[PDB]
Write a protein that binds this DNA or RNA. Structure first.
Ligand SMILES: [Mg+2]
Ligand SMILES: [Mg+2]
Ligand SMILES: [Mg+2]
Ligand SMILES: [Mg+2]
Ligand SMILES: [Mg+2]
Ligand SMILES: [Mg+2]
Ligand SMILES: [Mg+2]
Ligand SMILES: [Mg+2]
Ligand SMILES: [Mg+2]
Ligand SMILES: [Mg+2]
Ligand SMILES: [Mg+2]
Ligand SMILES: [Mg+2]
Ligand SMILES: [Mg+2]
Ligand SMILES: [Mg+2]
Ligand SMILES: [Mg+2]
Ligand SMILES: [Mg+2]
Ligand SMILES: [Mg+2]
Ligand SMILES: [Mg+2]
Ligand SMILES: [Mg+2]
Ligand SMILES: [Mg+2]
Ligand SMILES: [Mg+2]
Lengths: 77, 149
RNA sequence: UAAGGUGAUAUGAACCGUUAUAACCGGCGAUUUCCGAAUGGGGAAACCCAGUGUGUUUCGACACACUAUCAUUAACUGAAUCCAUAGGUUAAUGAGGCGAACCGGGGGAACUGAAACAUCUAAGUACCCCGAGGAAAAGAAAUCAACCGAGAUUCCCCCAG
RNA sequence: AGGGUGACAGCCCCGUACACAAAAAUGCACAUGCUGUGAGCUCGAUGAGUAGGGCGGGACACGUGGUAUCCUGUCUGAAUA
RNA sequence: UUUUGUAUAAUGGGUCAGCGACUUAUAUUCUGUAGCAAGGUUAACCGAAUAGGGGAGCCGAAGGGAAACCGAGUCUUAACUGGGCGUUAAGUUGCAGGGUAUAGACCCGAAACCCGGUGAUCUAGCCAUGGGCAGGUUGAAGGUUGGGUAACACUAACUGGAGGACCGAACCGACUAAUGUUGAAAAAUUAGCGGAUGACUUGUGGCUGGGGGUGAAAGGCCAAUCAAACCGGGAGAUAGCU
RNA sequence: GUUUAUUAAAAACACAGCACUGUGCAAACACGAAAGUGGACGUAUACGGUGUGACGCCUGCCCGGUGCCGGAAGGUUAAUU
RNA sequence: UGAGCCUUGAUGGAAGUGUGGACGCCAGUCUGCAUGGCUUUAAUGUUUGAUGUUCUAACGUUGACCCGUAAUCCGGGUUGCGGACAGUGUCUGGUGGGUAGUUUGACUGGGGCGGUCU
RNA sequence: GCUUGACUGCGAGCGUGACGGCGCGAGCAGGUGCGAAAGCAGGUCAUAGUGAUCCGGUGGUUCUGAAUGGAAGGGCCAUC
């Protein structure tokens, strides 16, 4: 449902606010692209519906430190 | 993105180098493929001495035998009787094997490729300026004296 | 608790009690058809059909009981590929649905007012959706003050239209 | 207090003040057994894709205004007493 | 009632009985009135509850200047003048009333706008599966045989049986007239009329839902409703009008 | 043949035919926040859109304006830095 | 190929003849390749943009096959094709009656037209 | 001819407006000019030649400036 899956980023709702200050609900949504990550240690290819930046996380922490959680909260993958 | 290397890799290969390459080239090839691992403490603050575990240690502590040059000195007149003949000469050939094997006395046994013969040893009888240079590092000074029966 | 009782329109009829469970009142239970989350499957709600068991058996019938899905865990099984997973079966747990308001969260109008109308207003209201408790939410300063100091949050009165 | 009773009753009736009563079942307090939690003391440790920042929005009484502060869809991204 | 003006042939009322429209909360200012007086008065809250306590605070006795600031003065100005606003006006708190503000704000009334649902048992398209079309007529293509040709063309009889083909019941439809118009009927009856093997007609069930559907297109149909359905809500929308 | 069920059956809609134009298929296009679906289990002799409306003889001149198609060298120009 | 950064380059073992390059204030020279006794423009390096090629390894696949599975879905696997393109998110220029909210004055010998408005 | 009174601060008192506002104004203070002087000049013989507020721009000012010193901003005066 368009969710970062790793950071839980969802599509927020805002206003278009065109010139003359005209309000018009628009709503923003995450990047997401679903990657083909290689757990390596788990010796498998786990594809997750990640998202820009949310991917930078997989790098900063770990494709395992990430999956450390996720499965922690009982998620897919 | 830094990460340590683990193989050839064109513009970067030190089987343990740290180069800042795009995170795309990584987590897509250099990594998940077997070619490099992120530079994360453990991969360093726990694997950084493995590198300095030689040039720094296995280079000056390695006394396994490098002290050979120093060990060989206390001798009792290292001489080899190549046997004289015909107005005084040599029946044998004191080249290399003999100079290095000049330790088979007390059953001891030293190297051999540690010869110091800038040229093909000649035939005489006097002392040989043979400097049994063990390791390509430390030198030495062994003597050889041809005689007869 | 008691001399009267078998709810009402409802008399009557057959009866039950006057000393101790006659009636009736309160606690705890028993039974509690079928529909309905409805859960064995199906379905035009209250109906149609099945599998596996089971006892008395005229030993067939009878009927009754278990069998939904998902989640966690445990055991056993187990593909593409040694492995290993995926998948499969079982069991034990728990959820499911309903409900007045109050409460937290997701989403969010317009009429209207501006004596017209776009910014602005109505209003984060109405409304939809999710979740929770007896309350919720909030909460022990990376708060505020002003060189003096105060010391979490919450609610009321002021400050001040 | 109040209600009923053949018209308006303190003393007809039911109640009323007051004083009493629980096999059991339970709300809430305490107090305790069980399971689980785990107290205290010495020395340590001190919340990074985070704080900030650019773009777009939103919340702040505060309509970007000279506009601090809070939140984040997007791109970034530190010090570390 | 409305009007310059109504017996007015201008509005409203058949009649009666009951109901039916300037309210309420808070705030602000006046008037009356009571308390106290350069003072008046408490708010929440405590409570031995209409007490008593609580004076946080609000209003008033000082004003002028944009302000710093000064002060019965103060601004203006270089001006110590003049000029403006002030200075020997009693205020304050209740209680009742007049007015105003925020509220539905005297009462009743739109056409409408927005939000969530209910409707394809009528109708419009389509989907699946079944049914129907008395009778009478015309007679295409193709074929056989004779003629004909070098062979084909071509020809004529017969055979054959086509068609949004012809006449006409059922069935479908709806051009005309009359009657009906408080109808027999919220569109029909009667006499005529058009199609009638087809883009035909009909039964059962299904699918499209409202700014949306469907439409051989009239804005037509979407349950006697349609230039945006019905139901409930925002809602006592708004009504400088009656 | 179709049409304003309930004042309009028509010269109106439709029609076979004609023309232009878009679409190389995961088609154009349409329903849908998306998944997906229709187009079509079709594939340019196909499908969509538009206008004209059997058939006969025909369908002239204008590309200035607007639209569409091609060019895109040069002028102007967003965020971004 | 821009632009940088800066290392090696010109004006601010020995003569004597050739053959390029730089323009020549031109007739002068500068500077390169045998035999003979800091400021201009580069070259490699290195960075970083602009194109444009090739690659695979993200990503696409509504090609083929295998397993879940005696499923057209979906997921995993293999292979082929494509490939950093496409596509999506955020930002941004164009287009945009497809849709939405509205505006579009009053006077007036009825209104409108005409005229008027200080 | 010579000049800058088309000056600065104020203003008794009036006129005219529902109001916002508009107009006339002797005289006072400071500095000007013209004249020998009295004196005249605060734009044109007069009456049309015009746009309130807000939001801002510019110059000036020690008015204010959110802990304090500055500063941004605000006020005041001139002006677009
Ligand atoms: Mg069921
Ligand atoms: Mg059942
Ligand atoms: Mg309005
Ligand atoms: Mg009249
Ligand atoms: Mg009358
Ligand atoms: Mg009456
Ligand atoms: Mg016919
Ligand atoms: Mg007929
Ligand atoms: Mg039907
Ligand atoms: Mg209708
Ligand atoms: Mg309302
Ligand atoms: Mg109303
Ligand atoms: Mg006809
Ligand atoms: Mg009609
Ligand atoms: Mg008709
Ligand atoms: Mg036509
Ligand atoms: Mg023509
Ligand atoms: Mg419009
Ligand atoms: Mg409106
Ligand atoms: Mg008018
Ligand atoms: Mg004049």
């Amino acid at each position: 449902s368009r969710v970062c899956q790793v950071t839980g980023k969802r599509p927020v709702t805002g206003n278009n606010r065109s010139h003359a200050l005209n309000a018009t609900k628009r709503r923003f949504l995450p990047n997401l692209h679903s990657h083909r990550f290689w757990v390596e240690s788990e010796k498998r290819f786990v594809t997750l519906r990640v998202s820009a930046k949310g991917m930078r996380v997989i790098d900063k922490k770990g494709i395992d430190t990430v999956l450390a959680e996720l499965r922690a909260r009982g998620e897919k993958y | 993105m830094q990460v340590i290397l683990l193989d050839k890799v064109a513009n970067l290969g030190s089987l343990g180098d740290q180069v800042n390459v795009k995170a795309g080239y990584a987590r897509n090839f250099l990594v998940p493929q077997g070619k490099a691992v992120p530079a994360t403490k453990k991969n360093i603050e726990f694997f950084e001495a493995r590198r300095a575990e030689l040039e720094a240690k296995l280079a000056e502590v390695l006394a396994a035998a490098n002290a050979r040059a120093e060990k060989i000195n206390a001798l009792e007149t290292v001489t080899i009787a190549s046997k004289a003949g015909d107005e005084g000469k040599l029946f044998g050939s004191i080249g290399t094997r003999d100079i290095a094997d000049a330790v088979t006395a007390a059953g001891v046994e030293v190297a051999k490729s540690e010869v110091r013969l800038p040229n093909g040893v000649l035939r005489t009888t006097g002392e040989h300026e043979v400097s049994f240079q063990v390791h390509s590092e430390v030198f030495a000074k062994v003597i050889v004296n041809v005689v007869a029966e």
